[PDB]
Amino acid sequence: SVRKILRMGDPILRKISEPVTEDEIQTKEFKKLIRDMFDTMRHAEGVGLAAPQIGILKQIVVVGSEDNERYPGTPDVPERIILNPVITPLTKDTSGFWEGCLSVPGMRGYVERPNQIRMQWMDEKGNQFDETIDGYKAIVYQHECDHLQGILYVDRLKDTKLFGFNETLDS
Amino acid sequence: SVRKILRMGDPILRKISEPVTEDEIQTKEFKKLIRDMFDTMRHAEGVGLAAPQIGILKQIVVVGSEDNERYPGTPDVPERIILNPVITPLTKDTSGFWEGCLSVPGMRGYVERPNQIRMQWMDEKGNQFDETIDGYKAIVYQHECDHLQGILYVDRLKDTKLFGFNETLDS
Ligand SMILES: [Zn+2]
Numbered sequence: 151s152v153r154k155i156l157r158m159g160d161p162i163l164r165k166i167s168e169p170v171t172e173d174e175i176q177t178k179e180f181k182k183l184i185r186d187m188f189d190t191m192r193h194a195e196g197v198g199l200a201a202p203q204i205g206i207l208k209q210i211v212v213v214g215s216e217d218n219e220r221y222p223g224t225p226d227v228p229e230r231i232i233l234n235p236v237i238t239p240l241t242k243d244t245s246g247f248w249e250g251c252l253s254v255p256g257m258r259g260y261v262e263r264p265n266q267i268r269m270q271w272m273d274e275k276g277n278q279f280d281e282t283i284d285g286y287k288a289i290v291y292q293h294e295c296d297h298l299q300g301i302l303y304v305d306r307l308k309d310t311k312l313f314g315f316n317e318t319l320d321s
Numbered sequence: 322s323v324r325k326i327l328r329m330g331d332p333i334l335r336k337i338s339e340p341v342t343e344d345e346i347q348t349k350e351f352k353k354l355i356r357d358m359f360d361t362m363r364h365a366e367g368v369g370l371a372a373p374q375i376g377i378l379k380q381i382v383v384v385g386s387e388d389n390e391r392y393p394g395t396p397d398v399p400e401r402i403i404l405n406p407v408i409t410p411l412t413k414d415t416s417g418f419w420e421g422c423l424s425v426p427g428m429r430g431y432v433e434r435p436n437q438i439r440m441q442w443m444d445e446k447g448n449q450f451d452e453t454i455d456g457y458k459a460i461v462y463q464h465e466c467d468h469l470q471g472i473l474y475v476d477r478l479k480d481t482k483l484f485g486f487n488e489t490l491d492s
């Protein structure tokens with residue numbers, strides 16, 4: 151079931167999210183959240199979504215879109231559950247992108263993030279991962295983890311002159 | 322008659338505005354602009370408005386609101402036509418304010434501008450002024466001149482964490 155997606159300005163979006171325990175991810179409540187989160191993301195036509203966006207301060211993130219309307223060019227992103235992620239840049243190289251955020255409706259801003267990263271995380275079944283990610287997903291993952299730390303993409307804007315409303319940016 | 326108010330993202334809003342000549346302000350076209358600008362500002366329930374906002378790169382600004390709904394607290398601002406303004410801070414002191422902009426719909430951001438300034442300008446009849454301004458008007462005037470230089474308030478944001486959507490900020 152779709153849940154409300156908090157908008158920038160709501161203090162929750164700037165608070166820190168706490169890690170999920172290995173027990174908790176078994177709870178019937180956790181499973182309902184992952185369900186609602188996905189349900190919420192697909193409905194919003196999103197690429198990713200962090201728990202804080204729907205009001206929960208837990209280190210939980212879901213991704214996956216394929217043929218996403220909001221971001222035409224972008225390659226598919228398989229559905230995965232990302233828990234307690236910890237990221238580290240592996241390069242200073244960046245691939246600028248006009249990011250958008252479901253908590254920042256109708257806008258887009260240019261952001262340069264490292265295009266190669268190391269991500270450590272645990273999935274819905276408690277499986278541990280530590281892989282180096284690159285490309286579009288590296289951007290999505292970084293964007294999603296920021297949420298777990300109360301950071302939004304507008305905080306990483308490269309130039310406020312490269313920021314605005316969608317319909318307008320698209321000219 | 323109300324004219325379209327360009328939204329952030331439209332390149333016009335980042336271009337430089339040129340000064341108005343003493344002849345031009347006599348033209349029947351200039352007079353129509355001041356009329357439309359006022360008509361546009363009152364309809365938008367604005368406090369000020371610069372020509373570039375409606376698509377004209379001329380150093381033209383109009384102010385005046387009285388009992389403005391969008392900004393409750395604010396004191397009245399008498400209607401005046403500000404042409405070719407040139408501002409200079411007279412203090413380092415600031416009076417933070419949650420500014421908004423008709424070219425940046427539905428949002429508000431915290432901005433700290435000097436609360437005392439020197440403004441030199443010419444009115445619709447060609448009268449020259451050079452007065453020191455303070456208080457709310459100092460903020461409005463500074464905000465409006467930035468427009469004439471392609472600057473929006475989001476460029477002067479104090480903290481991206483102190484920025485967001487109205488309905489949300491108002492909690
Ligand atoms: Zn987001």
Ligand SMILES: [Zn+2]
Nearest residue numbers: 421422423424
């Ligand atoms: Zn403005």
